[PDB]
Design an enzyme around this catalytic site. Structure first.
Site, mmCIF file in Angstrom:
data_model
loop_
_atom_site.group_PDB
_atom_site.id
_atom_site.type_symbol
_atom_site.label_atom_id
_atom_site.label_comp_id
_atom_site.label_asym_id
_atom_site.label_seq_id
_atom_site.Cartn_x
_atom_site.Cartn_y
_atom_site.Cartn_z
ATOM 1 N N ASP A 8 0.847 -1.184 0.000
ATOM 2 C CA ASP A 8 0.000 0.000 0.000
ATOM 3 C C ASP A 8 0.884 1.235 0.000
ATOM 4 O O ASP A 8 1.670 1.440 0.931
ATOM 5 C CB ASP A 8 -0.931 0.017 1.215
ATOM 6 C CG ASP A 8 -1.918 1.174 1.185
ATOM 7 O OD1 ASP A 8 -1.950 1.925 0.186
ATOM 8 O OD2 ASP A 8 -2.668 1.333 2.172
ATOM 9 N N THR A 54 -4.749 4.660 -4.458
ATOM 10 C CA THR A 54 -3.614 5.220 -3.738
ATOM 11 C C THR A 54 -2.308 5.015 -4.499
ATOM 12 O O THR A 54 -1.468 5.922 -4.559
ATOM 13 C CB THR A 54 -3.537 4.577 -2.353
ATOM 14 O OG1 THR A 54 -4.715 4.909 -1.607
ATOM 15 C CG2 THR A 54 -2.307 5.039 -1.602
ATOM 16 N N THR A 55 -2.123 3.835 -5.093
ATOM 17 C CA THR A 55 -0.815 3.498 -5.648
ATOM 18 C C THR A 55 -0.577 4.179 -6.992
ATOM 19 O O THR A 55 0.499 4.742 -7.227
ATOM 20 C CB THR A 55 -0.672 1.984 -5.782
ATOM 21 O OG1 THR A 55 -0.851 1.370 -4.502
ATOM 22 C CG2 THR A 55 0.715 1.635 -6.296
ATOM 23 N N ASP A 58 -10.744 0.935 1.822
ATOM 24 C CA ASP A 58 -10.759 1.166 0.380
ATOM 25 C C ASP A 58 -12.021 0.599 -0.259
ATOM 26 O O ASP A 58 -12.606 1.226 -1.150
ATOM 27 C CB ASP A 58 -9.510 0.553 -0.249
ATOM 28 C CG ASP A 58 -8.234 1.237 0.208
ATOM 29 O OD1 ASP A 58 -8.323 2.350 0.767
ATOM 30 O OD2 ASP A 58 -7.144 0.660 0.014
#
Lengths: 517, 508, 513, 73
Positions: A49, A82-83, A380
């Site tokens: 993450d 996020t990534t 998420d």
């Protein structure tokens, strides 16, 4: 100190930008290989993450600054996403070097990245315009919580989590309000449970229970007495706690402190409730009196939780014992002390079928790493699910969207004869790095692997199916159900595309060097 | 933060368990070699260690990758037993296996299922030569006995092995559906006996009788007390401070000697001649309690009467204030058994019952420490042998069979990952290899031949690498419950692929 | 890795380097040492036997030789070097086998083979002795005492050595009769001839003056309490802010103990062993005067072993507080005696004490310390060498000679075994012969003369006979008047045998976290 | 393995001496000198016995190592 400009700054910006895109790229998606990360503390954190990697990195530069910053606007609202937003920002910056090296000023390309950032989010708009209601979207909520629980590898049979995230968003965050509630969703969990031990608590679970099981497990609808008042040591914040220093003092306090709690626990029930939630709990001496006075009540309620059980239940505020009154009470549809299936996880629930102002997802797990494995995954999920339960706009993930974008992007890029003709076209090239770095992680050569989707886009010219994101060999966006909310993918870009261009507009930096963060 | 990219990360992933694994792979496998722990960071010391954790934890584990297994292998030992040395080497094997495949430029993901699926079909082939030995109780006896002797092996135990293979199975054959660590009561002391231990009838307790107390107690009905007295008996008036100066400092000690006497009032109310309690009293107190004429036993052990109440059929309880808050315990005798120079007050209400006390007499704690674990390990492997009485051929023969099959499988099974499955299968025969030269024997032929030899169906015939010979795993008694072997397969296969998929490590 | 391989060699490096110069053994050989220590401490060192235990070494591999030194001595009492010096002979074969490519476990197991084959031959040669009769007891004491400090005082110490074990002697032969039962009490005053073997429990207890517990029906007690008084056990209501306040509580302290020491005197127990456990400090400094006033021997916080000697030997236990008089679990002594030889010295003798057929007590006496020393250490091994016979009887030779006899005859076993180890045992078999060569080695110049012949001669004297290092010349070595009990070397064999395979049982060295 | 192989015909010397058997120089399954049919002329080995100790004595012969700084041509 010093001022570094232009190429210096240009090599100050992308440099710190390039490496952290790499730690996340082999961390990217489900096949993104997890990263054990260890503090100076002897800690260990296995993290694919980015936000957790960013939370793990104190690494020093405006980039590393902006990076730890940039993902976590994606990680709360949208969650998953996020990534990609970071790694792609590096890929954009990865391009701007050669593209300024072609003699195109960094602001000559700058609009072109944002200008072509339009077609991508515009192409994302085209993917799936679908919006489904809570009871319809709940399957797409868990179908996306197939994916958005998937990357942490806590997903299937965790449709518990997937379903409890369906209602947890709906309970507090409406479908029509479309104002984010992660604040009135209470993320809650405890060690010693299990991932498959999972619940959505509608009201407030208070950790401590009634002073005895010898008094009922059950407080009826409402009658919750909201209390700041010691029946155990007060530890007041105005003065300091001290205890009895003498032998005659344990004599009298034992005799004094009993009959008052006898009166007060009766005076609570005199004011009335079947439940007295006390900021400062019942002592074991006050426990037997709550038994002896024949009243159910909670011993310990958090200092903040005395507001929580008040607000989260909608229970009308009773500040303290002296403010006790009948019409003002904490509220409940019912009150239980609930064993969760592992008696190690044991809470007294004040549950809301009346009004839930904090809905409680209660995850369980053998330990903390496992519940956090679930929670950030549930987050998420809960994130995208809430996004979807607002607007179910989805998109087939894994870059087959961007592979479909990039072609349409770089084409529509060329249309403007302005030098961003070329510069926007190179923008589209970056859109292909995430499924690339995913195909790396997938165990595949991304080069050929994307061209499969390219061909599939040459076929489809939108994602429906695709390549692997999970590593299987069934290459699908739809049937593999690699799907993201259409919202956050655009939000990824909007977060990814400008920060580059924003760093492009800011190359003028007073630093002795990059490490100033 | 310190960003560790994949070059050293995979490398550090490899070095951590290998650099400890080499130490435990000596100890582990058959025995041609061990770890002699030469101990100085903390002291001047020389130690002999067959225990993984005693090798692991004592030495610096500081490698973040070594953190994993040192944490993960211990749990496997803490779970099914003897998992420290196991999960360590076997993943350290895979680290070598990964390293080549890494150095072969292969996705760790491509390596994951290649091992992970190969882990299954090997555990499957492990289940094959796993052979249920529950047939009769004598079979289950000697199964457990072969299995009890299996985990004890490759470790230094003097008189321990033969007694606990009786006891551990004794603890099993009484509970019937599990083994008893709840029953066996381990009592350790200095008895002068080398390792010599025995099943203790009732439970002995260590105190010198003296002052005025007659030493032996006959026809003793114990009064079970969960709350005794420390020095002063605790109640409303139990504490005072009179000290205004240095005289009172010496005079306050004299004031609390009064509090020893009021303790007699509580016990004289109960009336029972034999009062057995948890909290000890001293010799100057012995004056006051022994002259009382009633026999007040100090430090009577909870698990001791917990032995009694189970076997005697009575009730040991908690929260003792007045005689009847605990049902009165019935012993035949409260006696003093003299072992050498020792004087041991000995409660005998029952003999070798379904709760046993086990008196461990040794001059060294470390052997008594490693004896407990191997016992702690065996009963768990015996309690799962109660459940799964398959005893799968050990000593690397299991590795071979799995190595042969998985290799046969990787041949057909994937179109690519035949890389990792055979690599997995390679790590299998590894643990066999390191110890045959340790007998001087050639592993190569062995892992080549005897694998294929017994993977062509000699599976009982297997590796004696203590002799460096080919011998029957069932007849040599080299074999163990199908679980522990698969259990030591579970973590180590998992332990490697974690740091395998770890391509970056932050360090603050 | 290379580290596993080097460290065993590095062990063989530091270890084997130590065990070798550990032979000048016996002889007047080599120049005396003033040893500046590892911390810079100048120390004059001689007589390797103690220089063994004396030695301060580092590394695991070197200290196991001190550990090896400690092992033989306490076991037999004889052959302190015998167990260590052969670790030089061991690591001879070890490396050569590791140089032969022989595996550590095989080299390890090679230790057990030669050991079994060794204990074979040493017993084969050894000539059995009677450990009941006074005779070989005297004789093994003799030669040992002839190798001990006093040859002259070996005479009276011998029956005091012989009767001591024969006090504790156990039926026929067995490994038993330890030196813990023996309580060696150094008595200042007297002489070595005045050293006295006492049958019973003697204590090293040294209390005030004399005539104190010299009386009859003087029991020796243990008290796990001490006496009472205000400002002893019983309370003080008065506090001391004032020297006058200090006096009345001490006066009341003294006056009450004076009654209690009567109760100890009427106990029949004229030695209390007063607990080192301190109640107020327990027995008052005001009390010690009073217990001694009744001719009762107590010194403040009596030496703890005396408490255990009275427990062990006499069977004494604490009693009720002297306020209650005594439960008289104080063991039975109708005489406890404070003996002043030459009107000097403090020795508590318990005569008529309960003794369990054992705890013979030699009282090693002298006007000097050296006098007590020269006695004390000499009788000790005389006690030991007889304890050796009792433990394991007969006699072999001494000074390493019979090991060459084992060495010749073991190479024959090394001929028979027909294994790798037959060579490994063989690589060790003649490595034994290094001892008398290295015993005679260290004294001088123009070196090479006697060394190989220090070996060659025995093989010339063949299987029965060889050179006797103590008297010189070749004969059957086991009696030249050169002996140690068969126990001593077979005790020497296994230990170094054991400890070295641990080095091979080492995969690699470590350092604790 | 030479050490291993030695141990066998070593054990054979305990069994049997001047044997028609021995090690396999042909690296066979049988270790013999007969099923091997390996041999030399009893001359040869004896002739071979002559030479080894012949140089051993030969490096001994004189006391003279003294060279110009050349003991090799």
């Amino acid at each position: 100190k010093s001022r570094l400009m232009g190429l210096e700054a240009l090599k100050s910006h992308i440099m710190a930008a390039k490496a952290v895109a790499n730690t996340m790229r082999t961390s990217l998606g489900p096949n993104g290989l997890d990263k054990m990360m260890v503090d100076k503390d002897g800690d260990v954190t296995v993290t694919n993450d980015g936000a957790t990697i960013l939370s793990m990195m104190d690494v020093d530069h405006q980039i590393a600054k902006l990076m730890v910053e940039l993902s976590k606007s994606q990680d709360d609202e949208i969650g998953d996403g996020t990534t990609g937003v970071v790694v792609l920002a590096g890929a954009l910056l990865e391009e701007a070097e050669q593209l300024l090296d072609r003699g195109i000023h960094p602001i000559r390309i700058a609009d072109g990245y944002e200008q072509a950032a339009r077609v991508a989010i515009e192409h994302l708009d085209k993917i799936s315009d679908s919006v489904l209601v809570d009871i319809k979207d709940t399957e797409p909520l868990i179908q996306t919580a197939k994916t958005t629980l998937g990357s942490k590898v806590v997903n299937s049979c965790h449709r518990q989590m997937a379903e409890i995230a369906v209602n947890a968003v709906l309970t507090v965050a409406d479908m029509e309000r479309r104002d984010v509630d992660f604040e009135l969703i209470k993320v809650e969990g405890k060690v010693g449970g299990r991932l498959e031990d999972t619940k959505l608590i509608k009201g407030v679970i208070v950790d401590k229970d009634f002073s005895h099981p010898q008094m009922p497990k059950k407080v009826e609808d409402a009658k919750i007495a909201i209390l700041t008042c010691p029946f155990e040591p007060p530890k007041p914040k105005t003065k300091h706690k001290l205890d009895v220093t003498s032998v005659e003092d344990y004599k009298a306090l034992q005799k004094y402190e009993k009959e008052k709690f006898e009166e007060m626990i009766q005076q609570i029930k005199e004011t009335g409730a079947n439940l007295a939630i006390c900021q400062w709990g019942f002592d074991d001496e006050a426990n037997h009196l709550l038994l002896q006075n024949n009243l159910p009540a909670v011993r310990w309620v958090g200092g903040p939780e005395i507001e929580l059980i008040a607000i989260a239940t909608g229970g009308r505020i009773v500040p303290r014992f002296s403010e006790l009154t009948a019409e003002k009470l904490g509220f409940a549809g019912l009150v239980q002390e609930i064993s969760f299936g592992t008696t190690k996880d044991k809470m007294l629930v004040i549950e809301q079928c009346k009004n839930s102002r904090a809905v409680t997802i209660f995850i369980r797990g053998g330990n903390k790493m496992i519940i956090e494995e679930a929670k950030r995954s549930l987050h998420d999920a809960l994130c995208v699910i809430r996004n979807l339960i607002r607007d179910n706009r989805v998109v087939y993930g894994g870059g087959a969207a961007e592979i479909s974008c990039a072609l349409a992007v770089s084409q529509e890029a060329d249309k403007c004869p302005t030098l961003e003709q070329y510069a926007m076209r190179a923008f589209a090239d970056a859109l292909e790095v995430i499924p690339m770095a995913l195909s790396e992680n997938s165990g595949m050569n991304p080069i050929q692997t994307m061209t499969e989707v390219r061909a599939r886009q040459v076929k489809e010219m939108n994602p429906a199916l695709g390549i692997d994101c999970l590593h299987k060999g069934t290459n699908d966006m739809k049937q593999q159900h690699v799907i993201e909310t259409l919202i956050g993918k655009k939000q990824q870009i909007s977060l990814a595309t400008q920060m580059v261009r924003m760093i492009l507009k800011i190359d003028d930096i007073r630093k002795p060097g990059e490490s100033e963060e | 933060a310190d960003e560790e990219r994949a070059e050293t990360a995979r490398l550090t992933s490899f070095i951590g368990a290998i650099a400890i694994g080499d130490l435990v792979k000596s100890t582990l496998g058959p025995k041609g070699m061990d770890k002699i722990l030469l101990s100085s960071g903390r002291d001047a010391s020389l130690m002999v260690t067959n225990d993984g954790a005693t090798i692991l934890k004592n030495i610096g584990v500081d490698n973040p990758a070594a953190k994993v297994l040192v944490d993960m292998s211990r749990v496997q030992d803490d779970e099914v037993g003897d998992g420290t040395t196991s999960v360590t080497v076997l993943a350290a094997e895979l680290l070598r296996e990964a390293e080549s495949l890494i150095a072969k430029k292969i996705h760790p993901q491509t390596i994951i299922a290649g091992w992970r699926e190969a882990t299954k079909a090997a555990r499957e082939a492990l289940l094959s030569s796993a052979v249920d030995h529950g047939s009769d109780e004598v079979k289950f006896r000697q199964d457990l006995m072969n299995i009890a002797g299996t985990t004890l092996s490759s470790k230094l135990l003097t008189h321990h092995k033969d007694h606990f293979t009786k006891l551990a199975v004794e603890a099993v054959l009484r509970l019937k559906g599990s083994g008893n660590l709840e029953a066996i009561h381990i009592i350790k002391k200095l008895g002068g006996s080398l390792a010599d231990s025995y099943l203790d009838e009732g439970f002995l307790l260590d105190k010198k009788i003296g002052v005025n107390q007659p030493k032996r107690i006959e026809n003793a009905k114990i009064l079970i007390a969960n709350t005794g007295m420390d020095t002063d008996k605790i109640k409303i008036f139990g504490s005072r401070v009179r000290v205004d100066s240095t005289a009172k400092v010496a005079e306050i000690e004299h004031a609390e000697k009064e509090k020893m006497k009021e303790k007699v009032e509580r016990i004289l109310k109960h009336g029972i001649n034999c009062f057995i309690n948890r909290q000890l009293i001293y010799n100057y107190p012995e004056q006051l309690f022994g002259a009382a004429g009633v026999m007040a036993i100090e430090h009577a052990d909870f698990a001791g009467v917990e032995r009694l109440a189970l076997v005697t059929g009575g009730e040991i309880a908690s929260t003792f204030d007045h005689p009847e808050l605990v049902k009165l315990g019935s012993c035949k005798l409260i006696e003093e058994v003299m072992i050498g120079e020792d004087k041991l007050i000995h409660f005998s209400g029952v003999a070798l019952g379904e709760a046993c006390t086990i008196v461990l007499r040794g001059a060294t704690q470390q052997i008594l420490d490693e004896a407990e674990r191997s016992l702690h390990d065996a009963l768990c492997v015996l309690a799962q042998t109660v459940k799964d009485s398959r005893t799968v051929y050990g000593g690397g023969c299991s590795e071979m069979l799995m190595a042969h099959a998985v290799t046969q499988l990787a041949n057909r099974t994937p179109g690519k990952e035949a890389v990792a499955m055979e690599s997995y299968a390679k790590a299998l025969r590894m643990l066999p290899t390191i110890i045959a030269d340790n007998a001087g024997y050639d592993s190569a032929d062995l892992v080549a031949q005897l694998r294929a030899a017994h993977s062509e169906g000699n599976t009982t015939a297997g590796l004696d690498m203590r002799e460096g010979t080919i011998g029957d795993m069932a007849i040599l008694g080299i074999t163990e419950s199908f679980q522990v072997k698969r259990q030591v397969l579970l973590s180590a296969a998992e332990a490697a692929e974690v740091i395998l998929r770890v391509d970056n490590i932050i360090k603050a | 890795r290379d580290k596993p391989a080097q460290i065993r060699f590095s062990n063989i490096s530091a270890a084997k380097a130590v065990a070798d110069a550990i032979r000048t053994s016996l002889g007047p050989k080599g120049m005396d040492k003033m040893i500046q220590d590892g911390k810079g401490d100048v120390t004059i060192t001689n007589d390797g036997a103690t220089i063994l235990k004396q030695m301060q070494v580092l590394h695991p591999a070197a200290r196991m030789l001190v550990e090896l030194s400690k092992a033989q001595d306490i076991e037999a009492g004889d052959g302190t070097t015998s167990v260590v010096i052969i670790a030089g002979s061991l690591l001879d074969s070890c490396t050569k086998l590791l140089q032969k490519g022989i595996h550590p476990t095989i080299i390890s197991e090679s230790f057990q083979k030669a050991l079994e084959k060794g204990i074979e031959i040493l017993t084969d040669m050894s000539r059995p002795v009677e450990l009941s009769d006074r005779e070989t007891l005297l004789n093994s004491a003799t030669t040992s005492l002839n190798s001990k400090v006093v040859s002259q005082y070996s005479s009276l110490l011998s029956p005091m050595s012989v009767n001591a074990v024969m006090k504790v002697i156990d039926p026929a032969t067995a490994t038993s009769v330890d030196l813990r039962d023996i309580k060696i009490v150094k008595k200042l005053g007297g002489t070595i001839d005045d050293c006295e073997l006492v049958e019973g429990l003697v204590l090293t207890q040294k209390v005030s003056n004399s005539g104190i517990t010299r009386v009859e029906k003087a029991k020796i007690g243990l008290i796990q309490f001490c006496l009472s008084a205000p400002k002893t056990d019983m309370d003080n209501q008065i506090v001391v802010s004032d020297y006058a306040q200090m006096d009345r509580v001490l006066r009341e302290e003294r006056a009450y103990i004076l009654n209690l020491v009567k109760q100890i005197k009427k106990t029949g127990c004229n030695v209390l062993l007063i607990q080192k456990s301190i109640l107020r400090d327990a027995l008052s400094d005001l009390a010690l005067h009073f217990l001694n006033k009744m001719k009762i021997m107590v010194i403040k916080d009596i030496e703890r072993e005396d408490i255990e000697f009275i427990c062990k030997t006499i069977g004494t236990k604490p009693v009720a507080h002297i306020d209650q008089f005594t439960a008289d679990m104080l063991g039975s002594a109708e005489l406890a005696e404070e003996v002043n030889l030459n009107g000097s010295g403090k020795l508590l003798k318990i005569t008529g004490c309960a003794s369990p057929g054992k705890t013979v007590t030699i009282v090693v006496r002298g006007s000097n310390k050296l006098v007590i020393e020269e006695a004390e250490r000499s009788i000790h091994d005389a006690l030991c060498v007889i304890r050796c016979l009792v433990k394991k009887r007969a006699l072999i030779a001494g000074g390493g000679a019979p090991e060459i006899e084992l060495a010749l005859r073991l190479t024959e076993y090394s001929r028979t075994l027909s294994g790798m180890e037959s060579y490994c045992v063989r690589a060790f078999a003649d490595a034994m012969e290094v001892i008398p060569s290295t015993l005679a080695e260290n004294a001088g110049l123009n070196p090479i003369s006697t060394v190989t012949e220090l070996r060659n001669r025995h093989a010339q004297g063949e299987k029965t006979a060889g050179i006797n290092v103590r008297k010189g010349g070749i004969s059957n070595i086991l009696e030249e008047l050169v002996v140690q009990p068969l126990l001593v070397s077979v005790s020497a064999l296994t230990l170094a045998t054991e400890t070295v395979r641990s080095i091979l049982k080492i995969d690699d060295v470590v350092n604790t976290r």
